[PDB]
Design a protein around this nucleic acid. Structure first.
Ligand code: FES
Ligand SMILES: [K+]
Ligand SMILES: [K+]
Ligand SMILES: [Mg+2]
Ligand SMILES: [Mg+2]
Ligand SMILES: [Mg+2]
Ligand SMILES: [Mg+2]
Ligand SMILES: [Mg+2]
Ligand SMILES: [Mg+2]
Ligand SMILES: [Mg+2]
Ligand SMILES: [Mg+2]
Ligand SMILES: [Mg+2]
Ligand SMILES: [Mg+2]
Ligand SMILES: [Mg+2]
Ligand SMILES: [Mg+2]
Ligand SMILES: [Mg+2]
Ligand SMILES: [Mg+2]
Ligand SMILES: [Mg+2]
Ligand SMILES: [Mg+2]
Lengths: 122, 48, 72, 23, 74, 137, 128, 58, 86, 97
RNA sequence: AAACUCCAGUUGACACAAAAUAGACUACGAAAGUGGCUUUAACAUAUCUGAACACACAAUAGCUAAGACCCAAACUGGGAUUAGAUACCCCACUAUGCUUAGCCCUAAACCUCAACAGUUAAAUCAACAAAACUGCUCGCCAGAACACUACGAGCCACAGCUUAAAACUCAAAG
């Protein structure tokens, strides 16, 4: 089914970032994934210092890969991303747009619970 | 209707032929998912 | 009552009338009551659309000199 | 409720485990 | 207590009796001790308000029934 | 400008200066307020030790270290040694809820140092090591 | 199991899906779906083969077929997850519920009961 | 808003396990608690320590 | 350890008013639950004892919040006696 | 008979059900700006529904999104990102009084 | 007091341990249980009832084998207290809590309130507790103590578990 790879990349120059992005997309395709879109969220300071592959990273390039892969591909891709030294953090989730929000009428008021205790005179 | 919609989207899907071109286009572009909500329930998109 | 549907719509569109309700007078008619009466009179004419009938009711009151300031 | 019924059983069981250990 | 003055006047005007004050325990069921052995109890009790000041039935409603006195009540 | 309780962000540009020094350059006074002792170390903004004083180093022994007056005495001692090395403004970082949590800062002020900010850094595990068993008192 | 290229049960009968792009076909195939989608096709195949009316799912026969597909899925899960006690309970309960269904079917309709046993390869054993 | 009491207590209708186990019935009393005296604290500790400190010096 | 220092639980002193700053900081930690959490973390509270306390603290909130709602509802009637003498 | 007798209707004056500010809006873990609005500026603690004012469904969604964003390298844990300190206040909590 | 000073504070690197806030929510599961994040698989039954033993599960403790070491900690040692202190307080450190593979099958395993269906009418109803009842079915109980015992039998259990009496004694126990 449809997935989303939130790939935080190392702070590199454009040629190395392009090579890393292509390499990662090629790995997805090799595992049977139909890559749909690639989004650049920009390079920003990490929320906290992340130590990956014996390197301390304070900045990273946030990218998103929208793709369709078979369920078995996910585990294999996770293993590939772990071995890539240019990837700071990589997570695969079920694509959020596939999940449909149920229509909400609004907040229904709940009345005070009654008849909790008998009406005997204490 | 869903098959028809899907048949149109697949035209824009990344392929090995266009992979390099799509990677360069992504590097140039910027996508923002951040927006704020007011007390009135109105979305305040970012101004940047 | 059947007219409560009219009163609810009127109160939503225009709000509480500027004229203050005098509950001491048994025959006191409010702006909303006047609207209900005109609305009912136009229902006897044979208008079948509430929205059209509601619009026509307001126009008749405006012609009679009633002040109808909508919430907007 | 008080625990007087439990207390009788508590002493019986303790003495039993002590007797079994000894013998 | 908003109508204690009104009710006490109405009773005096029609030549009857009013009890708008705190109802002491035993006014009806222990009257012969409180008032005297030859005291005559009311023949009718009209409750203009049947609830006391804690929103519970006025004690005299129960006591009137004990003494077999008919009661009118709003 | 309205006073901002929020500290100036190191990256952004701020106009707030203390003796011509930015918030990121003010020396730090690390206070460890334990249940039985208070330890104060004044370090520079580059982590160079400048002064150290505890209730133990001021001559209080056993239960007398776990008192406000003992922590206040340590604060004054640390300020004196820090003021000799050129410290005026300090960023206080207190750790722990001991008896000398507030008294230690009063001592630092009584010693001639100016506190520009107070940070609480008491360690709170988010789930961590299981603490010692409850006491039967 | 059904081939992975098999189209999903929902999209198998939409007109013109035989002529869509190959990418669209595999996106709508079993390969790109979860395990539950393949189970639906399994049930469909059994319903058509054994049941007189595939559309009727409330018959005692359709319920047996549906339960047998579930039973097989639990056995496959338990093969990978041997110490999953929750699923082991679900399998044994499901087996006991199919035995009760089969007993009722044997008592009511023997001719159809025999066809269920043949198609689903179920051997009816009498309780101890 | 007051937290809900629907399904919180162990009752015949309630199928789930009890969320709450009040040791007293959850019923408002006709009284409130009495005013509590403040815990006494030693005063003028700082001023005493300045005078005593000077005594040591002099 | 990993996060940037001097951002969390940091309060700036206004006009050298350290007392007001400490009271503010202490109020922020109390409202968030850090002060009360630290005190409970000194000794390990066993699961059964933690469940018994949460149940107690929850029943106390419900009762205290309902008593307060009645006090504010009846405070209107603290007026002077209008029918004095009746 | 008589036409003035009350008739049976659903309350016409009944007001519409209230809605939380986030009702009908997708909550995303990538939308860190929105998520930051529901955490404490000083400690980063997630605010309860009594403070945030969200409905039970949206309170759960916000919580799960924060926890996800915080561990995936999108959101800080121990404090609120200073960049989002000037966003609209939507939480009923006062720290200075 | 002992202990520690190969100690303590700042900073950096840094788990086979445990999972603040959310949670004032009351959800999931047959129960036991389940509250960090992601993904995969996945939550029986179109009438109901239906096992101390058949079948499958079952907190914590414990057993067997192989690993892990932050912290906690039976036992043990030291310090203190005390008439004594085999405890309560302080310190140190084991088994054990963790993982893998097999056992063991117990709990105030109690929300001490069985499953399913239905009712709020009347005498509501000993007391207290969490108002009083109807239909139907299975399970269980008939003074206290002996007795979570003896014997027999079964069990990977061998200081064990399950089932479970009698004699003598009492006029109470509850
Ligand atoms: S009230 Fe609609 S989702 Fe919150
Ligand atoms: K956690
Ligand atoms: K219990
Ligand atoms: Mg005995
Ligand atoms: Mg009790
Ligand atoms: Mg010594
Ligand atoms: Mg909590
Ligand atoms: Mg059954
Ligand atoms: Mg039996
Ligand atoms: Mg077990
Ligand atoms: Mg073990
Ligand atoms: Mg230890
Ligand atoms: Mg060990
Ligand atoms: Mg339990
Ligand atoms: Mg029981
Ligand atoms: Mg049963
Ligand atoms: Mg036992
Ligand atoms: Mg035995
Ligand atoms: Mg034997």
């Amino acid at each position: 089914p449809r997935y989303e790879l939130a790939l935080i990349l190392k702070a590199m120059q454009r040629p190395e970032t392009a090579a890393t992005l292509k390499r990662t997309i090629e790995a997805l395709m090799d595992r049977g994934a139909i890559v749909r879109d690639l989004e650049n969220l920009g390079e920003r300071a990490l929320p906290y210092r992340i130590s990956a592959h014996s390197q301390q990273h304070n900045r990273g390039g946030y990218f998103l890969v929208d793709f369709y892969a078979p369920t078995a591909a996910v585990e294999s891709m996770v293993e590939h991303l772990s071995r890539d030294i240019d990837v700071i953090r990589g997570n695969i989730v079920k694509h959020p747009l596939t999940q449909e929000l149920k229509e909400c009428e609004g907040i229904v008021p709940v009345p005070l619970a009654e008849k909790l205790y008998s009406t005997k005179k204490r | 209707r869903e098959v028809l919609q899907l048949q149109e989207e697949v035209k824009n899907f990344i392929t090995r032929e266009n992979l390099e071109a799509r990677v360069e286009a992504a590097l140039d572009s910027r996508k923002n998912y951040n927006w704020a909500i007011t007390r009135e329930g109105l979305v305040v998109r970012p101004q940047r | 009552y059947h007219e409560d549907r009219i009163r609810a719509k009127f109160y939503s569109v225009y709000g509480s009338g500027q004229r203050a309700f005098d509950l001491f007078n048994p025959n006191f008619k409010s702006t909303c009551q006047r609207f209900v009466e005109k609305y009912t009179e136009l229902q006897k004419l044979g208008e079948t659309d509430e929205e059209k009938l509601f619009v026509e009711t307001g126009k008749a009151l405006l012609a009679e000199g009633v002040i109808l300031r909508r919430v907007g | 409720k008080n625990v007087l019924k439990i207390r009788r059983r508590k002493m019986n069981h303790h003495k039993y485990r002590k007797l079994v250990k000894k013998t | 207590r908003q109508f204690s003055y009104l009710i006490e006047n109405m009773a005096r005007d029609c030549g009857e009796y009013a009890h708008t004050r705190y109802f002491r325990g035993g006014m009806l069921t222990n009257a012969r001790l409180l008032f005297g052995p030859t005291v005559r109890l009311p023949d009718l009790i009209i409750f203009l308000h049947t609830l006391n000041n804690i929103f519970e039935p006025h004690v005299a409603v129960r006591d009137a029934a004990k003494m077999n006195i008919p009661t009118v009540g709003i | 400008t309205k006073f901002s309780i929020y500290p100036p962000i190191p990256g952004e540009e701020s106009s707030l200066r203390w003796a011509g020094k930015k918030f990121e350059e003010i020396p730090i006074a690390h206070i460890k307020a334990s249940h039985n002792n208070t330890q104060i170390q004044v370090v520079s903004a580059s982590n160079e030790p400048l002064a150290f004083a505890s209730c133990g180093t001021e001559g209080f022994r056993n239960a007398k270290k776990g008192t406000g007056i003992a922590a206040q005495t340590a604060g004054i001692a640390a300020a004196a040694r820090a003021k000799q090395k050129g410290v005026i403004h300090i960023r206080v970082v207190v750790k722990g809820l001991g008896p000398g949590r507030l008294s230690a800062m009063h001592g630092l002020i009584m010693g001639g140092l100016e506190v520009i900010s107070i940070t609480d850094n008491t360690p709170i595990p988010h789930x961590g090591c299981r603490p010692r068993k409850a006491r039967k008192l | 199991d059904p081939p992975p290229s098999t189209l999903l049960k929902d999209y198998q009968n939409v007109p013109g899906i035989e002529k869509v792009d190959d990418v669209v076909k595999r996106l709508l195939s079993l390969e790109m779906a979860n395990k539950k989608e393949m189970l639906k096709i399994k049930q469909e195949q059994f319903m058509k083969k054994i049941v007189a009316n595939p559309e009727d799912t409330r018959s005692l026969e359709a319920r047996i077929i549906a339960l047998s597909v579930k039973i097989r899925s639990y056995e496959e899960h338990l093969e990978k997850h041997r110490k999953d006690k929750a699923h082991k309970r679900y399998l044994l309960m499901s087996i006991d519920q199919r035995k009760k269904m089969l007993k009722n079917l044997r008592n009511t309709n023997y001719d159809v009961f025999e066809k269920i046993c043949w198609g689903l390869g179920i051997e009816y054993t009498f309780p101890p | 808003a007051t937290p809900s009491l629907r399904g919180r207590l162990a009752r015949f209708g309630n199928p789930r396990k009890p969320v709450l186990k009040p040791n007293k019935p959850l019923i408002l009393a006709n009284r409130v608690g009495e005013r509590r005296r403040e815990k006494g604290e030693a005063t003028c500790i700082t001023e005493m320590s300045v005078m005593m400190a000077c005594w040591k010096q002099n | 350890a990993k996060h940037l220092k001097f951002i969390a639980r940091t309060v700036m002193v206004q006009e050298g008013n350290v007392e007001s700053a400490y009271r503010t900081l202490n109020r922020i930690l109390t409202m968030d639950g850090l002060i009360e959490d630290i005190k409970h973390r000194r000794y390990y509270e066993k699961p059964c004892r933690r469940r018994q306390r949460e149940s107690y603290e929850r029943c106390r909130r419900i009762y205290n919040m309902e008593m307060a709602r009645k006090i504010n509802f009846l405070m209107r009637k603290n007026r002077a006696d209008p029918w004095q003498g009746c | 008979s008589n036409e003035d007798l009350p008739i049976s209707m659903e309350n016409p004056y009944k007001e519409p059900l209230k809605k939380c500010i986030l009702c009908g809006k997708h909550v995303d873990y990538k939308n860190v700006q929105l998520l930051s609005q529901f955490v404490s500026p000083f400690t980063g603690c997630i605010y309860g529904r009594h403070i945030t004012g969200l409905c039970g469904k949206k309170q759960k969604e916000i919580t799960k999104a924060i926890k996800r964003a915080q561990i995936m390298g999108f959101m800080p844990v121990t404090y609120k990102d200073p960049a989002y300190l000037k966003d609209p206040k939507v939480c009923n909590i006062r720290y200075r009084e």
